[PDB]
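Follow-up to my post from last week.
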Amino acid sequence: NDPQRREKIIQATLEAVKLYGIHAVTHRKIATLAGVPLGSMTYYFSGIDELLLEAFSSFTEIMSRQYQAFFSDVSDAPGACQAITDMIYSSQVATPDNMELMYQLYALASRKPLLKTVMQNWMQRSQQTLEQWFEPGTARALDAFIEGMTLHFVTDPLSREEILRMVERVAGAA
Amino acid sequence: RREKIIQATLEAVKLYGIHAVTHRKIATLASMTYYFSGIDELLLEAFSSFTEIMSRQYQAFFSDVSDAPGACQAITDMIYSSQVATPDNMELMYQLYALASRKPLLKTVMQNWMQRSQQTLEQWFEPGTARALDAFIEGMTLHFVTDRKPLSREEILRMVERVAGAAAL
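User reply:
Got it. Predicted complex:
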């Protein structure tokens, strides 16, 4: 079955999306990107749509891990305000490759429900992280504020000390 | 008859993909090579016009607001309204954000929008609070599109008032 080469194909599909367009993603294009035979495409996946769904799925699991990374050294809610600030301060550069792919996924999800399922599982994770030090009502508000705050750079402001003080107000703690 | 073309472009974009869009698939959805020559032209014009009408309506939501508490109620209504439905043009918006990252004129038109929304909220809130309110608003509608567990009007208003802090009258 060869799990590593299945992973490669998903990697190469993702790479074939950020590079050219999802409209352009074909079996041949991905196989030549993955350095793999045409047959492996049909052996592992039932169709381009299962493949795209898996690649987007894996893209969001990457993000989730890039997300909970910021909470490595967080014991407490005050440290969690700091990690949130770090994350919003740090991801002001770069690159809008992920964010570009992600806004593509938000819009596509509103008319492809398998993809919406994947989006939901991705946000469950973010909220679950925050609930380690906040109650859901605060976790939910902080998640939304983090997501909106990130947008407000993808168009283009603003100091760490200032980002921290907005976070601290959305959290009201300590 | 540019508006037919402008809305066809917007309709095509939302009706199956961005890059997908062709000068024909647009043409059937409402001169093309003659009026509006470049297919990317076109998107710029459609998205600009879209961004201007979106920005105007958001402002208009606050037309009868006189004060900060009123403004917290208005924001809560707007956020709750977006959750019980989900607005017409939220896909085009996420598409917009995707293009803004790649093409600088859409970054600039988007930029002009964000300061429009902030200028409204600055009529009652300090720009730090106005900035946080705008981001909270944007991030909340993004969450709706997915769709997380629904929030009551009561929960949103409590959240909005926290983010506004003082005033609260």
